[PDB]
Amino acid sequence: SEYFDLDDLEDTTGSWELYGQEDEKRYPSLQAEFFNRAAAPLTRRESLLAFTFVGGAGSLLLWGAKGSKDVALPIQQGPKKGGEKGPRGKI
Amino acid sequence: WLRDFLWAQSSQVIQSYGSALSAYGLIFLGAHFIWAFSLMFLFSGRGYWQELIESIVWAHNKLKVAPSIQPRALSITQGRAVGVAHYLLGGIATTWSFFLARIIAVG
Amino acid sequence: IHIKPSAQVVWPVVGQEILNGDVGGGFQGVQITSGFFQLWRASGITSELQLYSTAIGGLVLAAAMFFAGWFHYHKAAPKLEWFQNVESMLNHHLAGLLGLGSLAWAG
Amino acid sequence: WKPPTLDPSTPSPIFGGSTGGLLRKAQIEEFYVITWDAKKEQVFEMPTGGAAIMRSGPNLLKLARKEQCLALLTQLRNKFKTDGQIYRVFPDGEVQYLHPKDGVYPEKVNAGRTAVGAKDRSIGKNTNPVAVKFTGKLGTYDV
Amino acid sequence: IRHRDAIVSHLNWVCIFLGFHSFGLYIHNDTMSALGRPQDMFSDTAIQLQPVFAQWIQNTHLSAPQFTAPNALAPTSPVWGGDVVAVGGKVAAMPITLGTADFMVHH
Amino acid sequence: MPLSDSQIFIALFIALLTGILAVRLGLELYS
Amino acid sequence: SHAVKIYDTCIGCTQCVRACPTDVLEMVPWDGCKASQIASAPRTEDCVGCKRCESACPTDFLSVRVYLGSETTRSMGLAY
Amino acid sequence: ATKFPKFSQGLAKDPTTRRIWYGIATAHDFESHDNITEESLYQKIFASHFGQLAIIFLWTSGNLFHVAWQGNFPQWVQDPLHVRPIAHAIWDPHFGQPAVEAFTRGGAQGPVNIATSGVYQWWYTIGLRTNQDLFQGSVFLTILSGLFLFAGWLHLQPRFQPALAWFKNAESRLNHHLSGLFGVSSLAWTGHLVHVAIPEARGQHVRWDNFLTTLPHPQGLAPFFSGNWAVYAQNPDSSAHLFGTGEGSGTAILTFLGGFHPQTQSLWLTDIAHHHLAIAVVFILAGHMYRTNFGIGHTMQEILDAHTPPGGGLGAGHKGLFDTVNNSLHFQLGLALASVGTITSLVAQHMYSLPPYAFLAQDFTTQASLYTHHQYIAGFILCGAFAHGAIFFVRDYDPEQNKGNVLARILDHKEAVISHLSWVSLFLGFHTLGLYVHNDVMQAFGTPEKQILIEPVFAQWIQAAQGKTLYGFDLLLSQSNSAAFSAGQTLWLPGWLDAINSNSNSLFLTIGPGDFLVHHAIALGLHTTTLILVKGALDARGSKLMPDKKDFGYSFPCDGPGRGGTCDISAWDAFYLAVFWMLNTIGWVTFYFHWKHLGIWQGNVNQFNESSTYLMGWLRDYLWLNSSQLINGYNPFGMNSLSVWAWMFLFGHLIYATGFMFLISWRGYWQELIETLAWAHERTPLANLVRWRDKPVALSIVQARLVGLAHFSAGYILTYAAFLIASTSGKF
Ligand code: CLA
Numbered sequence A: 001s002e003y004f005d006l007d008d009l010e011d012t013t014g015s016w017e018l019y020g021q022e023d024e025k026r027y028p029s030l031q032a033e034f035f036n037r038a039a040a041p042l043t044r045r046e047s048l049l050a051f052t053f054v055g056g057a058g059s060l061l062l063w064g065a066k067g068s069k070d071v072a073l074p075i076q077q078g079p080k081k082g083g084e085k086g087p088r089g090k091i
Numbered sequence B: 001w002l003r004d005f006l007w008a009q010s011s012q013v014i015q016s017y018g019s020a021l022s023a024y025g026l027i028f029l030g031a032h033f034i035w036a037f038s039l040m041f042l043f044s045g046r047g048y049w050q051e052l053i054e055s056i057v058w059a060h061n062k063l064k065v066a067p068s069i070q071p072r073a074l075s076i077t078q079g080r081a082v083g084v085a086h087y088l089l090g091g092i093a094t095t096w097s098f099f100l101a102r103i104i105a106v107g
Numbered sequence C: 001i002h003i004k005p006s007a008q009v010v011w012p013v014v015g016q017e018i019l020n021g022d023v024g025g026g027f028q029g030v031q032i033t034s035g036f037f038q039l040w041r042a043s044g045i046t047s048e049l050q051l052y053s054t055a056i057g058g059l060v061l062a063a064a065m066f067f068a069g070w071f072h073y074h075k076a077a078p079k080l081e082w083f084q085n086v087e088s089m090l091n092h093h094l095a096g097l098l099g100l101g102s103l104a105w106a107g
Numbered sequence D: 001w002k003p004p005t006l007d008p009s010t011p012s013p014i015f016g017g018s019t020g021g022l023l024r025k026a027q028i029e030e031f032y033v034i035t036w037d038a039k040k041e042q043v044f045e046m047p048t049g050g051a052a053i054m055r056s057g058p059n060l061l062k063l064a065r066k067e068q069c070l071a072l073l074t075q076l077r078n079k080f081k082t083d084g085q086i087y088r089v090f091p092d093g094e095v096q097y098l099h100p101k102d103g104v105y106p107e108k109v110n111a112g113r114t115a116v117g118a119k120d121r122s123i124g125k126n127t128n129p130v131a132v133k134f135t136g137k138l139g140t141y142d143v
Numbered sequence E: 001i002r003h004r005d006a007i008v009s010h011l012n013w014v015c016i017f018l019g020f021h022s023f024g025l026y027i028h029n030d031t032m033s034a035l036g037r038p039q040d041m042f043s044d045t046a047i048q049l050q051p052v053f054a055q056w057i058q059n060t061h062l063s064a065p066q067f068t069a070p071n072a073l074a075p076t077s078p079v080w081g082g083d084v085v086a087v088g089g090k091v092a093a094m095p096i097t098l099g100t101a102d103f104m105v106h107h
Numbered sequence F: 001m002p003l004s005d006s007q008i009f010i011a012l013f014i015a016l017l018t019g020i021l022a023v024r025l026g027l028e029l030y031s
Numbered sequence G: 001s002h003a004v005k006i007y008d009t010c011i012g013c014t015q016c017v018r019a020c021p022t023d024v025l026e027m028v029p030w031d032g033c034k035a036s037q038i039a040s041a042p043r044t045e046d047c048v049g050c051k052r053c054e055s056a057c058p059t060d061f062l063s064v065r066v067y068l069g070s071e072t073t074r075s076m077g078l079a080y
Numbered sequence H: 001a002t003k004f005p006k007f008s009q010g011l012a013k014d015p016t017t018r019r020i021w022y023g024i025a026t027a028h029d030f031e032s033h034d035n036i037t038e039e040s041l042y043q044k045i046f047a048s049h050f051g052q053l054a055i056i057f058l059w060t061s062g063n064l065f066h067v068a069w070q071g072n073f074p075q076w077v078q079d080p081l082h083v084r085p086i087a088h089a090i091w092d093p094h095f096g097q098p099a100v101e102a103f104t105r106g107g108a109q110g111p112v113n114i115a116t117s118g119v120y121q122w123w124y125t126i127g128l129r130t131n132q133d134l135f136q137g138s139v140f141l142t143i144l145s146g147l148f149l150f151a152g153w154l155h156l157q158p159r160f161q162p163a164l165a166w167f168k169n170a171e172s173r174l175n176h177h178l179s180g181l182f183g184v185s186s187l188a189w190t191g192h193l194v195h196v197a198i199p200e201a202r203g204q205h206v207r208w209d210n211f212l213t214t215l216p217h218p219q220g221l222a223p224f225f226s227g228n229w230a231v232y233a234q235n236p237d238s239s240a241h242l243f244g245t246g247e248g249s250g251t252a253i254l255t256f257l258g259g260f261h262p263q264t265q266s267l268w269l270t271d272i273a274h275h276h277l278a279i280a281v282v283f284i285l286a287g288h289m290y291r292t293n294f295g296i297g298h299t300m301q302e303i304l305d306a307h308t309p310p311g312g313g314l315g316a317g318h319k320g321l322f323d324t325v326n327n328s329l330h331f332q333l334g335l336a337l338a339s340v341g342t343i344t345s346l347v348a349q350h351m352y353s354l355p356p357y358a359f360l361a362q363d364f365t366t367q368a369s370l371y372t373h374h375q376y377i378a379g380f381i382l383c384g385a386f387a388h389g390a391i392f393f394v395r396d397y398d399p400e401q402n403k404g405n406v407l408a409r410i411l412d413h414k415e416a417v418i419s420h421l422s423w424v425s426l427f428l429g430f431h432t433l434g435l436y437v438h439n440d441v442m443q444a445f446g447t448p449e450k451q452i453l454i455e456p457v458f459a460q461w462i463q464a465a466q467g468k469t470l471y472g473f474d475l476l477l478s479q480s481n482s483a484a485f486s487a488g489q490t491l492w493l494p495g496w497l498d499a500i501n502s503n504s505n506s507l508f509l510t511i512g513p514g515d516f517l518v519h520h521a522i523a524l525g526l527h528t529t530t531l532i533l534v535k536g537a538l539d540a541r542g543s544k545l546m547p548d549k550k551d552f553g554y555s556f557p558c559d560g561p562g563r564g565g566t567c568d569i570s571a572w573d574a575f576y577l578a579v580f581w582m583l584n585t586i587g588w589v590t591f592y593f594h595w596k597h598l599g600i601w602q603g604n605v606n607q608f609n610e611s612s613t614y615l616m617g618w619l620r621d622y623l624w625l626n627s628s629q630l631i632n633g634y635n636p637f638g639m640n641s642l643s644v645w646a647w648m649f650l651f652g653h654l655i656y657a658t659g660f661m662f663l664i665s666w667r668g669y670w671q672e673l674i675e676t677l678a679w680a681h682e683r684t685p686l687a688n689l690v691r692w693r694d695k696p697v698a699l700s701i702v703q704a705r706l707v708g709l710a711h712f713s714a715g716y717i718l719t720y721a722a723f724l725i726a727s728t729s730g731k732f
């Protein structure tokens, strides 16, 4: 019998935990306490979106304005060979 | 691949006219045609064709030339079979003419 | 080394005799790519007479195959248990078809 | 006749399992149960793939779709000459009896049934779609 | 039949992985070449993908008459290594080396 | 003769105002 | 859900009901045809839209019509 | 369930990924939205039209701004034949240094794109000269876009919402659009040409700060008011005039010279001014035809009801058609799209042969790009015209209200129309393909003298009647003593006959048997595309296979495998099939334009004349021969500025091929595949921690046809655009 109406609908529908185990004690207390106070302001979904937005946008424009120049991207050096020559005497 | 194999090596089949290899140039073109022809069977569906045949059958009925064996569009499965048969024939014969003209002329 | 194999000749009509290319050996025809010449040379065939003999013998055997298909359907049709002798068929096709075929070809 | 109750103590057929059975939908949306009474122990084809052995006497089988239950029931009726019952089971424990809805198979006409979807006209008498613009109806068949 | 979903899903993943890591290498190369970055390409003169297993197989089959097939005078084919076989001033067979392009097309 | 920086900033500011009006129209069309 | 409407040309042949793979249709008593029955569609929430019923119908034109509508889990034939 | 398709509760309750796709695809079908009324539908359309107008003006502002900021417009103005016009700058961080060097062109300080849109020639012709002029125009158009957006918001407010009856006032809208939107706009454009563009063509710098000080004509407005209008035609610009300078210039402002300015190879600006002035007067007059609020003018319903032949040849005639057209937005959109798309084709045919902008004819890449662009746009628009005709027949057509009129009567012999379209398509295809294949076999067998080369004597006779003396037909404008000749001899015939008898322009090109064959291919394409579209529109309401098709709507997948099978039976599917044929037809048209002009521009007309009579000639001498520079845009030896077109060429081939997957493989294969994938995710550890919100399903049948067609079309267009621009610009 693989069916039961009440108190075994979890077994009937196969709602089992194959690998998850109940456990409260995994990490050290000071390590955990450190990481809860580290990630405390980002535990709100609006704050993390604001933080990732501001940081990512600032990193991207700082890369574009300055960082791309520092790593010497070819688009920031520009041409040095005077320009490609077109046909029919066109410039 | 596109330039140095397909574009460069097709020079023999497309210059084959007026030589004994001209049959390969003609088959190259005809196989391109048969391949393209297959796309009408693969991309369409028989409901359109049956309705078009209804109008054509009206024209034959008006002139008393409607056949007794009632014309139907091909079945859905036959439409697929015709499409894949002409697709394979056209593509493979294209490569056949390309290969044979190329390697006979430069071999 | 210099002569291109050819075993198909077209008739002169509607200009198609251009396909009888100058393949060498004082001969005009369509160049073949099936490899028969190399196979006939490896077999030791040196003349058109031996090619004629194989062609005649093949047609006789072709008639024998068509006779057998008519015979084993219309005159002496094997029963189902004959076909289901897979052990006998494997023994005969391994030793008799492939084995004696390879021995005779080695001969 | 009254709608039967799903007996949860019914045994299941002998099956080695497969990858084609129930998924998370059975836990959170719905699933289905087909029950039948077998005259003898015999092999039948699962609608989810693979051979299974129906036990002699009452059998119970849980399936993901109503169509799977009706496919198995069609096999039971046409190959084994066996009738069956189909239920819909909800995650809250509610069991809804589905088929045959009034105890008689739907292909057999039965008194007490009322027509729904009947139109008192031939199909060519439907009105034009311009006549149902800005009315909220589903189409000309809806009026 | 009872685990067809596992078979088909695993094969689906294999096909997606193979398509990405075979055709996307070509797309990477076309994009790098168009952008004027041949040093960023998958090539024999850039980021290399050498088919080292097939190269080792070739070396093993070349060295076979020495040790592992002592009574065979020569390897089975010139494609493994060694000298050009020339007939009538044309190459009959020669070693077929395998580099990055061969890796890419085999995948 | 090239444009000035101020001309580019003028064009960008007028485009920002136009974009605000566009967002206003899009929201009005929505609801 | 799909809408399955029945019309009055139905000859009560029951073939559409037998064809239905999800038990949408059933035969109910009627006086409009010789067979004294008509197809009915009480369970269109289970209709997948396969139009096996229309393929089974012998009348010209059809007496059972399926109008594909808003899609649900049942009408999409999903087991997941 | 969700709230994204808030206009459709049926889509909002869909638990699958189909809800998102269909929510996007049905967003602009306002008539099918939940709880929509006719008045709110019209108001939403009015505001959407304001939004589209604002987008158009912003797009034009962006083109002007990027040319002013990053282009080389003053340098091009100095040397229009030897400067490549710059579209905009490139800032791509993926570029290598060779790509940075290769794309630096036109005298720019960095990598740029060279424009193919012809805006330099147009803006220079209409009098713009500096970067400041372009910038001021761009700022003005951004402000215009803001005004349009504000008006769109404003007329959605309840006290400014127009009533439904205002939208159905046809007579007032036609009066105003003809008189003001066409006529007054053309009159104001004549004002711009006379006050600004013509003086700037003569070296006179006229702008906002001095145009009230500058005399457009030396005698002012006295010849206009007195009626002595021939004063304005005296002393035109001479044949030795240098454009943009006072050397060789005249003082005329309204002329009828005909033909081309010898230096710019374009139409005379004074001719253009007189054209737009006459157009202004004709359109202002035509805008006084219909009755509004003053007791005079025509009533269109009574005009239509009056036009029924008394012999009964058209039945009830046009009776009731006013309400049919006026109540159906799809009839109106179908008419608008048919007319606008035909006009787009007319623009394409007339701008290559009668170039209106200075130094446009010498810019070969730009001319080819503009012709191809407008012909493909015209093809898509014509497909849409017939699509909305079919939609009208399904959704809006009332047979009782149209009893016996021309619409009902053409529906009543739809089999005759469709069967005759089928016959003409079959005849054209059989014989055009047969003649081409015969010629191909003749060339293959070494005997080109056995080709069937039919001389296009009818079109050559037309060219002779318009004055081309090359063919020896002496009639009308090619007969020096004819009445038609003598009438135009002092006005426009000298310039016109100089232009039409010169082979150095595109005005009525010399034609021969290759032109015959390709024109019959074009006729085959037009007739077959029309056959598919017309059969779709006329069978939209029903056919013998599906007599109740109107009950199912314009677009639906099929009616199932019964009755033999009914794939692609909807009118939408006829649109989908016809797009392939339209793309094929415009492909043939544009191939013809480009190859004939390639021979003319390279100074070798014999290549087209000899090779176009057989299809190997097209393949080898057009596609294969001209792809050589394009596919060498990047190679193992390096890259050049054509590498972007080589990459886009391959990109288009890839997108085209990807479309074949959606078009060839159909739904149920993918649905079963996705079922196995959904099993795999639920059973995979560390991945089944995440779940989908929408149940993944295969794309629908119709959606697949759409997506496959979109990939096919996009790949088609991208491939040909890359080939066209690369092949023309690598030589020129
Ligand atoms: C060139 C044409 C083309 C392409 C690209 C595909 C694509 C695919 N086919 Mg389809 N197919 C085609 C033609 C094509 N087909 C045609 C004409 C038919 C009709 C017969 C089919 C019928 C068909 C069947 C029956 C099946 C496929 C399957 C597949 C997949 C193989 C797995 C794979 O390689 O994933 C990798 C994807 C690619 C290699 C495509 C290119 C991806 C690029 C390189 C990555 C780019 C990412 C991009 C840069 C990031 C996004 C950025 C952007 C959004 C801004 C893949 C999705 C099989 C599949 O589903 O099994 C898993 C399958 O069973 N196809």
Ligand code: CLA
Binding pocket: F025, F026, F027, F029, F030, H004, H005, H006, H007, H023, H024, H025, H027, H028, H044, H048, H049, H051, H052, H055
């Ligand atoms: C000429 C361009 C044009 C115009 C005038 C409109 C006009 C309209 N659209 Mg259409 N749209 C366009 C282009 C356009 N759209 C393109 C290219 C797409 C993708 C194919 C769409 C897809 C789309 C969807 C899916 C929806 C609209 C809706 C709307 C209405 C409200 C728009 C809005 O700003 O809501 C502002 C609302 C928000 C910002 C919050 C909700 C987000 C909405 C639901 C989706 C975003 C809509 C927006 C137009 C997408 C822009 C696409 C972008 C690539 C250009 C309005 C009638 C919505 C409407 O309700 O239908 C009548 C609607 O649901 N549009």
Ligand code: CLA
Binding pocket: H045, H046, H047, H049, H050, H053, H166, H167, H169, H170, H172, H173, H176, H177, H179, H180, H181, H182, H185, H343
């Ligand atoms: C003088 C009065 C007047 C004017 C100027 C307009 C102007 C306009 N109305 Mg009409 N309107 C009027 C009175 C007027 N209206 C009245 C009295 C009513 C009620 C009875 C209406 C009711 C009305 C409605 C309901 C709608 C309009 C809309 C429109 C716009 C049409 C779209 C467009 O831009 O076409 C541009 C057309 C031209 C410029 C004419 C030329 C067309 C040809 C084919 C082009 C070729 C010209 C030339 C060769 C091209 C040169 C190209 C260049 C690049 C070189 C346009 C802004 C629609 C809309 O868009 O607005 C929101 C709309 O939905 N109007």
Ligand code: CLA
Binding pocket: H306, H307, H308, H309, H310, H311, H312, H313, H314, H317
């Ligand atoms: C001898 C005198 C005479 C002549 C020759 C005409 C001629 C005409 N009148 Mg009549 N008329 C007359 C006396 C005359 N009228 C008198 C005394 C009055 C009273 C004042 C009228 C009042 C009147 C009215 C009120 C109207 C006409 C109209 C017409 C036209 C259509 C009539 C018809 O039935 O078409 C029959 C047409 C068909 C049955 C359809 C044929 C469709 C063909 C087969 C399609 C072919 C398409 C082709 C294959 C595709 C392209 C070809 C390709 C090569 C490009 C026609 C020009 C109508 C009109 O058109 O006015 C402009 C109209 O409304 N007349």
Ligand code: CLA
Binding pocket: B033, B036, B037, B038, B039, B040, B041, B043, B044, B052, H422, H423, H425, H426, H427, H428, H429, H430, H433, H524, H528, H531, H532, H577, H578, H580, H581
């Ligand atoms: C190269 C590709 C190709 C070809 C040749 C055709 C051919 C045809 N199309 Mg199809 N089409 C195509 C691609 C093609 N299509 C694609 C990709 C689509 C999108 C799905 C369509 C969608 C489409 C629609 C929707 C319609 C057509 C129609 C037509 C016909 C147009 C009229 C005509 O030209 O008659 C001349 C006929 C031909 C040129 C066909 C080839 C004739 C051959 C060469 C005759 C000789 C055969 C040879 C001697 C036999 C040897 C056999 C051998 C085994 C012995 C014709 C049958 C229309 C139609 O049916 O009108 C009547 C129609 O409504 N097409």
Ligand SMILES: CC1=C(/C=C/C(C)=C/C=C/C(C)=C/C=C/C=C(C)/C=C/C=C(C)/C=C/C2=C(C)CCCC2(C)C)C(C)(C)CCC1
Binding pocket: F012, F013, F015, F016, F018, F019, F020, F022, F023, F025, F026, H051, H052, H054, H055, H058
């Ligand atoms: C730095 C600075 C600043 C800032 C600025 C900014 C931040 C700017 C930006 C700008 C921008 C950022 C702009 C933009 C623009 C936009 C636009 C202009 C848009 C438009 C759009 C449209 C037009 C739309 C349309 C539509 C659609 C698409 C769909 C739906 C419908 C509609 C119609 C709505 C300031 C002043 C504070 C200060 C000083 C410094």
Ligand SMILES: CC1=C(/C=C/C(C)=C/C=C/C(C)=C/C=C/C=C(C)/C=C/C=C(C)/C=C/C2=C(C)CCCC2(C)C)C(C)(C)CCC1
Binding pocket: H330, H331, H332, H333, H334, H335, H338, H339, H342, H385, H386, H388, H389, H390, H392, H393, H537
């Ligand atoms: C389906 C439908 C529809 C649609 C339709 C369409 C889409 C159509 C198209 C159409 C078209 C697209 C048409 C076109 C046509 C054109 C024409 C008809 C033209 C004419 C011309 C002429 C008449 C001219 C003459 C001349 C002159 C003036 C000068 C010299 C030269 C000549 C002689 C040539 C609708 C919506 C209505 C409705 C519903 C249904």
Ligand SMILES: CC1=C(C/C=C(\C)CCC[C@H](C)CCC[C@H](C)CCCC(C)C)C(=O)c2ccccc2C1=O
Binding pocket: B040, B041, B042, B044, B045, B046, B049, B050, B072, B073, B074, B075, B076, B078, B079, B080
């Ligand atoms: C073109 C097309 C058709 C129309 C094609 C048809 C009906 C096939 C026509 C084949 C031949 C030409 C019909 C006539 C055969 C007779 C034996 C001819 C006798 C005449 C002598 C000259 C031989 C479909 O029916 C169809 C169905 C499903 C998917 C796609 C398509 C599809 O693409």
Ligand code: SF4
Binding pocket: G004, G019, G020, G021, G022, G023, G024, G025, G046, G047, G048, G049, G050, G051, G052, G053, G054, G066
């Ligand atoms: S469409 Fe299919 S599921 Fe729906 S009533 Fe008909 S047969 Fe039954």
Ligand code: SF4
Binding pocket: G006, G009, G010, G011, G012, G013, G014, G015, G016, G017, G038, G039, G053, G056, G057, G058, G059, G063, G064
């Ligand atoms: S609807 Fe058709 S199939 Fe069903 S009972 Fe009536 S006649 Fe028979």
